Amino acid sequence: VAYWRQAGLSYIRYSQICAKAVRDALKTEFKANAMKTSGSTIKIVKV
């Protein structure tokens, strides 16, 4: 167990929130591909 596990948080989420900073760390000349990419265009059907 490390400093993000313990609670029940998969490496996935780790790797995830990471990106959420690299993308935040950009400008207008290079960003037209980081907005387009990324997203949870899936749904969760248990209806």
Binding site: I12, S38, S40, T41, I44
Partner: protein
Amino acid sequence: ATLKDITRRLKSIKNIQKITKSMKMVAAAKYARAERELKPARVYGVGSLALYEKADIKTPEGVSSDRGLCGAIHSSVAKQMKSEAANLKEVKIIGVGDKIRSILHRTHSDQFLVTFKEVGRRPPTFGDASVIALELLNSGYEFDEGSIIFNRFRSVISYKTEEKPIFSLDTISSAESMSIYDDIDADVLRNYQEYSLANIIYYSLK
């Protein structure tokens, strides 16, 4: 054959023709991007396999969309799902694509596990993938070994269904032939068998 009728049927068909030709050219560009956005996503998705495919692994112990009207696509992951639901233990229904809920609910309505929606409308990118893997751990299912099929793309006019195996339990993953490798910490593999899953799934989608 009344004039009146011929004329009716004529009008009906003349539209079906236009709607089709139109809708063809929608999918046409839609495809021409999902292919550019693929050149990468392959090189990548492939190397995610560089490992597994240099050390096969036994074990002692569905991907598409919601929008139909593409013909061959959605059957071909059933000619490998109802045909692999009688070959295989007991894995439960885990596939993305509401169109599987349709072509697999009157015939396999029980083993259901977790289905998805809004697949295909917008071009899936990584998050899309992970959010399925992130939900195969969260929704704790007892993982053992992997069955995830999808349609590899050969040509615009042809593709080819494909069965790939990913080893859902790190137990089965750290098998024997996998000793050629060091630092086999049950926690640096818990963090690689997990990132290879949402690395296959992502390759399968794209």
